[PDB]
Amino acid sequence: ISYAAYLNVAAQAIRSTELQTASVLNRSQTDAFYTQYKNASEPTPITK
Amino acid sequence: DPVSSLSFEPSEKPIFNAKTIEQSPSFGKFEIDTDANVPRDLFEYTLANQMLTAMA
Amino acid sequence: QLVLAAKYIGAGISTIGLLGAGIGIAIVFAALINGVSRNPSIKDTVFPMAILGFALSEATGLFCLMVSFLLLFG
Amino acid sequence: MQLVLAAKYIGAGISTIGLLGAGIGIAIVFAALINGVSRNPSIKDTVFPMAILGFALSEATGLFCLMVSFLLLFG
Amino acid sequence: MQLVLAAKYIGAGISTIGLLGAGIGIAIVFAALINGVSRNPSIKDTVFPMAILGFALSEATGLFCLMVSFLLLFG
Amino acid sequence: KLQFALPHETLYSEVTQVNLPAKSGRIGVLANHVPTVEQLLPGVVEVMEGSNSKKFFISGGFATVQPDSQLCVTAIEAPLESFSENIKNLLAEAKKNVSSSREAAEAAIQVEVLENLQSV
């Protein structure tokens, strides 16, 4: 758990407060896949 | 780097390692105790903050 | 006689009192050095403070010392 | 007679010992002042009244001690 | 007679106790010097004369104790 | 001079007294303050410029008094509206979650956030 991952989780939690905006929700919802690569082969894409 | 609103110049910049924080004379310009691992925290925090700016 | 011995002894006891003031003086100067090293720039504000603090610490020592002199002489 | 008169001069000496504590005490308040003001150089206007108060109270304990010394010294 | 000579020696011994506080004091000022120089890397030129000043004043308290010890000892 | 800046907003990036909840407990900065680096913990932050006070609920970040009297505060989400019940519901769920799973750390952060919110 990186310090900024800790802060990130806190930020997401903080919009849960009652009052909300779409950009906030977008800032609290994103997806990706981090893919490893070798010195070649790509270990299977794992969702970020 | 979007140099002008009709140009883009590919740009790079150096992210400063935790070593950098350590051996910079930043004790002489700022104050931390030692209880905080300000290198290990600031490095991580600016790793992302610098990257986010770059992404933007 | 006994009283004259007691005077000399009494004076001696009073001399012990100075030790506390000595420690005090040092504590103020230690704080000065820490403060100066901490800010690089507190010095002009802190220097009259340090002199005041020194004076008051020293003053307690002085009271012990004068009592020694008074007991010594009479 | 000699025993009592001697006792005043001895007892006065014993009293003088108490003063050492107050001497250390005054310095401790001043140390906090210097360090405190160093840590935030603008705290001074609030803190300096507090410092003189702390000095006076610590000093007062010394005063009571010194009074008993002088009472034995001159009585 | 014997008692008066004895008393002079006793009073001298007692006075020697006074010096101890100055001893600890001197160290405290120097401890601050070391910590300061390690803290700043560069405070040393201002702070070194400060350290000497603090040393001298602390030392002087012990000196007073010492001269009173001699005063009682020799008479 | 106060620089309070978020990714998606920029606030105070003059200001008289600022009250911050920091790794070193709570710190208040008023005028000259020795130049510091502090990790801001998940926080209730008050910023006062004159007598006027604005109250911010903050996800933690970094605080760094610069030696040029620029209080760099960087945080992800900071106002009054940010504190302005659902979080208590969420914490119950998150607590149940701690039993199986990093999520434990998340829920711990949630307890902190609920307490911090409750503090308001």
Swiss-Prot record, chain A:
- Coiled-coil region(s): none
User: Which terms are listed as keywords in the entry?
Assistant: ATP synthesis, CF(1), Hydrogen ion transport, Ion transport, Membrane, Mitochondrion, Mitochondrion inner membrane, Phosphoprotein, Transport
Per UniProt, what is one Pfam family of this protein?
A: ATP-synt_Eps
Cross-referenced InterPro entries, in alphabetical order? ATP_synth_F1_esu_mt, ATP_synth_F1_esu_sf_mt
The cellular location(s) given in this protein's UniProt record come to: Mitochondrion; Mitochondrion inner membrane
Which GO BP terms, alphabetically?
Answer: proton motive force-driven ATP synthesis; proton motive force-driven mitochondrial ATP synthesis
What's the main place this protein lives?
Answer: mitochondrion
Q: Name one GO molecular function term.
A: proton-transporting ATP synthase activity, rotational mechanism
SUPFAM superfamilies for this protein: Epsilon subunit of mitochondrial F1F0-ATP synthase
Q: Member of which family?
A: Belongs to the eukaryotic ATPase epsilon family.
What PANTHER family does the database record attribute to this sequence?
ATP SYNTHASE EPSILON CHAIN, MITOCHONDRIAL, ATP SYNTHASE SUBUNIT EPSILON, MITOCHONDRIAL
Question: Further remark, if any?
Answer: Present with 4280 molecules/cell in log phase SD medium.
| Assembly with partners or alone | F-type ATPases have 2 components, CF(1) - the catalytic core - and CF(0) - the membrane proton channel. CF(1) has five subunits: alpha(3), beta(3), gamma(1), delta(1), epsilon(1). CF(0) has three main subunits: a, b and c.
Q: What is this protein called?
A: ATP synthase subunit epsilon, mitochondrial
Q: Which organism is it from?
A: Saccharomyces cerevisiae (strain ATCC 204508 / S288c)
From Swiss-Prot, chain B:
Name where it's found: Mitochondrion; Mitochondrion inner membrane
Subunit arrangement?
F-type ATPases have 2 components, CF(1) - the catalytic core - and CF(0) - the membrane proton channel. CF(1) has five subunits: alpha(3), beta(3), gamma(1), delta(1), epsilon(1). CF(0) has three main subunits: a, b and c.
**Main role?**
Mitochondrial membrane ATP synthase (F(1)F(0) ATP synthase or Complex V) produces ATP from ADP in the presence of a proton gradient across the membrane which is generated by electron transport complexes of the respiratory chain. F-type ATPases consist of two structural domains, F(1) - containing the extramembraneous catalytic core, and F(0) - containing the membrane proton channel, linked together by a central stalk and a peripheral stalk. During catalysis, ATP synthesis in the catalytic domain of F(1) is coupled via a rotary mechanism of the central stalk subunits to proton translocation.
Q: What's in the misc comment field? A: Present with 28100 molecules/cell in log phase SD medium. PubMed:12898710 reports two tandemly repeated copies of ATP3 (ATP3a and ATP3b) on the right arm of chromosome II in several laboratory strains, including S288c. This has not been confirmed by the yeast genome sequencing project.
**Family recorded in the similarity comment:** Belongs to the ATPase gamma chain family.
**What protein name does the entry list?**
ATP synthase subunit gamma, mitochondrial
State the gene name recorded for this protein.
ATP3
Question: What stretch of the complete protein does the chain hold?
Answer: 201 to 256 of 311
UniProtKB/Swiss-Prot annotation, chain C:
Subcellular location per UniProt equals: Mitochondrion membrane
Q: Name one GO molecular function term.
A: lipid binding
Q: Which GO terms describe its biological process?
A: proton motive force-driven ATP synthesis
Provide the site residues for: Reversibly protonated during proton transport: E58
The membrane-topology field of this record reads: Multi-pass membrane protein
What Pfam families does this protein map onto? ATP-synt_C (PF00137)
GO (cellular component) term, any one: mitochondrial inner membrane
**InterPro entries in the cross-refs:** ATP_synth_F0_csu (IPR000454), ATP_synth_F0_csu_DDCD_BS (IPR020537), ATP_synth_F0_csu_sf (IPR038662), ATPase_proteolipid_c-like_dom (IPR002379), F/V-ATP_Csub_sf (IPR035921)
Superkingdom of origin: Eukaryota
Q: Which Gene3D superfamilies match?
A: F1F0 ATP synthase subunit C (1.20.20.10)
Query: Which keywords appear in this protein's UniProt record, sorted alphabetically?
Result: CF(0), Formylation, Hydrogen ion transport, Ion transport, Lipid-binding, Membrane, Mitochondrion, Transmembrane, Transmembrane helix, Transport
Residue stretches spanning the membrane: 13-33, 51-71
What this protein is reported to do is described as: Mitochondrial membrane ATP synthase (F(1)F(0) ATP synthase or Complex V) produces ATP from ADP in the presence of a proton gradient across the membrane which is generated by electron transport complexes of the respiratory chain. F-type ATPases consist of two structural domains, F(1) - containing the extramembraneous catalytic core and F(0) - containing the membrane proton channel, linked together by a central stalk and a peripheral stalk. During catalysis, ATP synthesis in the catalytic domain of F(1) is coupled via a rotary mechanism of the central stalk subunits to proton translocation.
> Its family?
Belongs to the ATPase C chain family.
Q: What is this protein called?
A: ATP synthase subunit 9, mitochondrial
Q: What gene does the UniProt entry assign to this protein?
A: OLI1
Curated annotation (Swiss-Prot), chain F:
**Secretion signal span:** none
Example GO molecular function term?
A: proton-transporting ATP synthase activity, rotational mechanism
Gene Ontology cellular component list: mitochondrial inner membrane; mitochondrion; proton-transporting ATP synthase complex
> Where is this protein chiefly located?
mitochondrion
Subcellular localization(s) per the UniProt record: Mitochondrion; Mitochondrion inner membrane
Some GO term, biological process aspect, for this entry: which one? proton motive force-driven ATP synthesis
Question: What are the alphabetically sorted keywords of the record?
Answer: ATP synthesis, CF(1), Hydrogen ion transport, Ion transport, Membrane, Mitochondrion, Mitochondrion inner membrane, Transit peptide, Transport
Give the protein's function: Mitochondrial membrane ATP synthase (F(1)F(0) ATP synthase or Complex V) produces ATP from ADP in the presence of a proton gradient across the membrane which is generated by electron transport complexes of the respiratory chain. F-type ATPases consist of two structural domains, F(1) - containing the extramembraneous catalytic core, and F(0) - containing the membrane proton channel, linked together by a central stalk and a peripheral stalk. During catalysis, ATP turnover in the catalytic domain of F(1) is coupled via a rotary mechanism of the central stalk subunits to proton translocation.
Per the record, the similarity remark reads: Belongs to the ATPase epsilon chain family.
Report quaternary structure and partners.
F-type ATPases have 2 components, CF(1) - the catalytic core - and CF(0) - the membrane proton channel. CF(1) has five subunits: alpha(3), beta(3), gamma(1), delta(1), epsilon(1). CF(0) has three main subunits: a, b and c.
